[PDB]
């Protein structure tokens, strides 16, 4: 299955992201994450919940769709409460094992939240080195916050089970997965806790990286 990982990467910028994908001691930020805002800087809305930078937790992503393998570099991780790897396929859903060589090959990331369906959201990285994430749709609850995670404080009914859209389990916690420090290099200092989620009655024992 390792062949199914899209692998189109140029790094003409010399960002350094290409090396981090392969060798552990080449890992990539504190300057740029100062745009992320704590949950307390937003404002409560108790109107009934309707549905609406990628490394900030308060990213509002559009719902996942099918994306061309052309623009994908590295593995693609989709998240139920737990992590899962999505590979390349053709437009009919059949797996393609050619390292993303074909222009036709695509990654089917379309999401319907569990328990009903598949995953809360997905992360990948495009070819220029930028982390990209989809999921949701996020929740609409100068400081408005469109909830992508478990925003219990700003709206009680906004929980990860209800409003989850990606790896962020709470505004301060993201799921730990093997390539977490590649997509979110700035979560390096995070402390790791063994956590447990109950979504639809299935126990999701996983590890979580938190602040």
């Amino acid at each position: 299955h390792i062949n199914r990982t899209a692998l189109n990467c140029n790094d003409s910028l010399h960002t350094g992201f290409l090396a981090a994908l392969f060798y552990t001691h080449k890992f990539n930020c504190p300057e740029r994450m100062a745009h992320c805002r704590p949950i307390d800087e937003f404002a409560q809305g108790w109107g009934p919940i309707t549905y609406a930078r990628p490394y900030c937790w308060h990213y509002a992503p559009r719902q996942c769709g099918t994306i061309p393998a052309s623009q994908v570099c590295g593995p693609v991780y989709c998240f139920t409460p737990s992590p899962v790897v999505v590979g390349t396929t053709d437009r009919f859903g059949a797996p393609t094992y050619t390292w993303g060589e074909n222009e036709t090959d695509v990654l089917i990331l379309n999401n319907t939240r569990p328990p009903q369906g598949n995953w809360f959201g997905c992360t990948w990285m495009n070819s220029t080195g930028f982390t990209k994430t989809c999921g949701g749709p996020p929740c609409n609850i100068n400081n408005t916050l469109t909830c992508p995670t478990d925003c219990f404080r700003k709206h009680p009914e906004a929980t990860y089970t209800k409003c989850g859209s990606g790896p962020w389990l709470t505004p301060r916690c993201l799921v730990d997965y093997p390539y977490r420090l590649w997509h979110y290099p700035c979560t390096v200092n995070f402390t790791i806790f063994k956590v447990r989620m109950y979504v639809g009655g299935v126990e999701h024992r996983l590890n979580a990286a938190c602040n």
Partner: antibody
Amino acid sequence: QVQLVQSGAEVKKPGSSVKVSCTTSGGSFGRDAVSWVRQAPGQGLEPMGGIIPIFGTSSYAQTFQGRVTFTAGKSTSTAYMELSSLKSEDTAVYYCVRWSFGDYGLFLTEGDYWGQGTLVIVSS
Amino acid sequence: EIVLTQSPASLSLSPGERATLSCRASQSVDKYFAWYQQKPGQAPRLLIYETSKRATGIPARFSGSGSGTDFTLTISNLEPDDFAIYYCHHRGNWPPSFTFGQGTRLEIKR
């Protein structure tokens, strides 16, 4: 089950350029790096760098910087080495080696696939 | 520019003995350390990869060890025509590159 086929033994006038070839069995290289190692008559194994065909990333060793160039296509069977401004010191045997690389996740270092060698003699 | 210094340069032994070769490194090394032999006129042969794992076909005589900056190859019950030149080797770093030892000659003791 991967095999490599290298260029034939060549003889080049001193101060010219020579291009040696390296072609792989299993369709194209992928996630794998194609590295070059030379050996002058009697001496040790002296690496030169390589190219990683999927990305285009060139690696040049310090002993050969500027006259050697590594080329390959993203999904071609063949990777190239050109060495320009040859002297008699360059008279040697050149190997290409296909390997998989990584330290970290899905991609770990596997593979040692060598070509059969390409003798290049440098004389007028 | 990791620089594998290999010693001895020449080892003078006779069959039946234990041949030990060392390779020290200018820096630490991420496993994936390899040992090769080369007979005259023939291309190098892989003996041990990943510091200790024996390649396919390699007799149990050849043993690998090491970690960090210091690695040794252990040849037990030296048999005839285990006598050749030997190279230590490392794979890694970015951009991915090869570093080889300078070499070691096993000759027949006289």
